[PDB]
Inverse folding.
């Protein structure tokens, strides 16, 4: 009795095409339909009773929070059904970490939710998408995969949505969680589970988004030498509810950034200090403005802050979410 | 006879002094004088005849291009002297990669220039700065260190300014070049040189800023889901000469970012597409606006773009610099 | 109020003294007593009521299974007391992964057991041992630390005994688990727990060795081009019960190694195929002789095989241990 | 007008075949002929005028020094011809680091020598070998690739034979040089050169192995708790000329290992202390027996020690080879 798996397609390079097999840059993402992906790796049909559903077909640099919200709602609907055992979501690599972390916080099920992506288009020589998709279906259909939070499967690895990130612009092995590792790996058609994330997610999460149609506006500002105050002013003037700061080092702030953050706080904007570095802990520091992002990178911090702002604007409550989610 | 090494101090956590040995976060960077750093490691007198000079005493999140330019000019003056064999620059960790890469491009000497920094303040239990400084003096004084480009020495490693970056907010081992490795290591009081960088630098660089007192203004804008067009408008309106884009994946651009970039281009602003990921190549793509950053991360790309704009506004010339520096 | 923590000292570089602060590669491991370690970082007394006990004082390349057996027995006796909340074990770095994984399998308590070590001797400039010890006491005394399996704390990281390994001969940051990450990190005097290991250990382990005064003999043989049959013959002749093979790639075997493994199997030895590579899965392959090590590296595989052989010689039972511990 | 490249085939998983696309473990390495590999990627004919030559067809765990000698001799012959611009050598992954380093030391040419391999067989879903082979031909035919030492090309990366190693049993991204990085990368059909290795190789090497048909015998012994003296005795009795020790930590030796090494030294065996850890420097230590391996891992140390012994048994000369090659 095969597991029943929905393959929910959103686009991405995994569905991308170019004229020739040697073109691995500058191709069209989000060009092929979900059934074409399935039928390119028909071994998936040995692992599961699969059903393709075309949710969207875009390059992931164009994925937007209002669309991710709809995606989360659709996945929750699917997983409430007795005839669905898990869902695989085909997505672009550029922003999978954002979409996956959003669903990690908002899907109220222990059934597997497995994002899958590809760094080479479907037409490329040695395209990675076929094996990635096979692995993702294997993970989604395995009873041992339940209760693990949302996963991102690619290049034989299983990453937690909370930790995994695209670390390299262009390589197949780009998805890594340097300090936290992988939840598991898939080698020789077998899953090896290594870790369970020690954070709240899915069925233990407070972030209910049923019925919503919009999310709080959050922008991300970079930290660097000579960083300007005017970008703070511009964000404030355009109505942001939060600013995530991709800070120098451990969320450190220049005199110009401090002035911009104090203006934001005066206007009721929540300021969250993360890091541009790529990894590690931004620790509390009562001498600096704003909250701190724990080990969340800027992209992830923005997603959690948007969701936090659906429930509260209390900085103490938001800070505790950042230490527990 | 021993080498003659100038220790040119700019501040940083290496010169920071907290109230207790356990405080490693929330201390004051840039408090101790250069001679106090030297006198904490009097072993240095066995490696070199050292002289301290106090250039500045600031936390590196406050280092600015106008000041970095002065630092480069002062180092050029020092290295023009026959009685100086190399220079060690004590600096904060947060923006050492920016200052070091600027000097890498503008120092007109083959004599060693070694930036050194610390992740723990000088007061801390197991502070790293004492050993880092001893290692940096050993590197700067070794004849085999000549002609290597500017170096960053910390935690037993020798990094090229072009590749090294602070990858972790808070750990001792934060400086890494994941794809390019270290130029060398220092183990057991001995230097092991591994690589020479295959890029132009120092005495083979066209960038000369000895007749300047400031650099062209360049800002950095992040890429993420829902990234706003208005931050492009704000940069344009505040007189930027260049914009570096810390892009999704391989410099990929949303419909909003493309509209922003096209406005910038129409105003004569140079747009340079880098990556937020942390590593790897942004490849050319004629269907997208702007130039591409090769393997330069956003912080490094901004430094090179500022220097490029002192010489040309021809995008073909600038693009070639980004492939060769 | 404060937790009661026993510091059980075995030796190591953390207890080493050299003649100068620059000696980092020629000093003596296992020279200072436990109260000298404690009184050198007296800040531990603010985290715990600490009591030092001198178990041994040796360099860890000389640690032996018979002594590890006694260490495990003593830790079990300490943790059986109601007045002991946790134990920190000071140990050498070279074989901490072996001792720690043994206790991970044999300690019948959920109270924390934290191994700590140092890469520089106690006399070194920027010695790492003081901070590592302070961190280890913090981890051992935190209620959140219970039930995590045995831990190795060093360089601000908390590694599981099952995954952590010494990856570099000589650096402070040598302990890593590349594919599995860290259980947690210690930054700014705060613990950040990231993962729980998804394997059996401690109170859920079958490997009780209380009462033993000896262990099964298990040797490790390397795989390489031209590897010889005669080392298998020698091991058999000297009474091994098991051989761990540090194999080429995924436990792959030359014609000579296969001949040696077949002789061992003929002579009643259990053969376990691991990998020399450093990481990853050795998958089943029924066209090759012997068992497979899953993601256990050679040093860890030897420990598990030795303990397995106190309970069984059944290959199916042993193979399932390797997939679950 | 195109470069002339010989594809010299030796076997490996790149030439492997299985009965289904999902079998990625347990397959037959060295099953397919070189022209089958070429014909799978006729795109190569746009990069180069290629000619296949079948040297051998074996799994690389079975590659032996006598055969590597013949490989080096053949490559030297090919590169002496005006009508050969470079050579691509198809090889198994398990021991490519050994064969490649041997040729790095013995091929007296600046023309590119590029080893290529695959982690999945040619029949696998998302097999890596087609793109790896195209990339290797691109590298071998580019003028910019001359004088770089022997290279290993796989997974978009260009590794030096002296630094690259198989770090994972089973993943596509297994070849890494953690401390030294890659010489270059291949992205979007373009080569990005990053580093030149700062070591002696190829045209500057003293290791002349013309007329030789065999090499001095060198075995590798592991270091671990309870390591036995009798394996040294066995190696001595079997006539080894060298022993490479894959030591605990920084080549550290137990009381038993010391006794074994002193027996070996008394019989005129050269003892070379490397590390089992995976990375880094084994520093000199006059209180321990034998020589030290610098940053060479055990597999590379054995290759260099064998070749060293074709010139001398003087331990000070051999030590200097280990610091310079």
């Amino acid at each position: 009795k095969l597991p029943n798996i929905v393959i929910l397609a959103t686009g991405g390079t995994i569905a991308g095409s170019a004229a020739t097999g040697t073109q691995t840059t500058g191709y069209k993402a989000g060009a092929l339909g979900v059934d074409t992906l399935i039928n390119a790796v028909p071994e998936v049909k040995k692992l599961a009773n699969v059903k393709g559903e075309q949710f969207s077909n875009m390059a992931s640099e164009n994925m937007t929070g209002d669309v991710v919200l709809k995606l989360s709602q659709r996945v929750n609907e699917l997983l409430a059904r007795d005839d669905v055992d898990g869902v695989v979501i085909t997505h672009g690599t550029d922003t999978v970490e954002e979409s996956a972390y959003f669903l990690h916080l908002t899907v109220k099920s222990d059934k597997p939710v497995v994002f899958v992506a590809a760094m080479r288009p479907a037409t490329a020589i040695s395209a990675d998408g076929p094996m990635n998709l096979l692995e993702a279906v294997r993970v989604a259909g395995d009873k041992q995969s339940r209760g693990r939070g949302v996963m991102v499967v690619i290049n034989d690895r299983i990453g937690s949505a909370r930790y995994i990130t695209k670390t390299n612009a262009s390589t197949l092995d780009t998805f890594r969680a340097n300090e936290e590792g992988y939840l598991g790996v898939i080698i020789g058609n077998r899953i090896y589970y290594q870790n369970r994330i020690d954070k709240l997610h899915t069925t233990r999460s407070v972030f209910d988004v049923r019925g919503l149609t919009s999310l709080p506006k959050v922008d991300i500002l970079y930290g660097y030498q000579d960083d300007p105050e005017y970008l703070y002013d511009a964000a404030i003037q355009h109505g942001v509810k939060g600013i995530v700061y991709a800070g120098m080092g451990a969320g450190s702030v220049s005199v110009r950034g401090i002035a911009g953050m104090r203006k934001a706080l005066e206007k009721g904007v929540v300021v969250m200090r993360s890091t541009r570095t790529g990894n590690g802990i931004v620790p509390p520091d009562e001498e600096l403005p704003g909250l701190v992002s724990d080990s969340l990178n800027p992209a992830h911090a923005r997603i959690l802050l948007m969701l936090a702002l659906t429930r509260t604007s209390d900085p103490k409550v938001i800070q505790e979410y950042f230490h527990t989610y």
User: Anything to note?
Assistant: The first strand of chain B starts at residue 4 and ends at 11. Chain B has two domains: 1-216, 217-325. The radius of gyration of chain B is 20 Å.
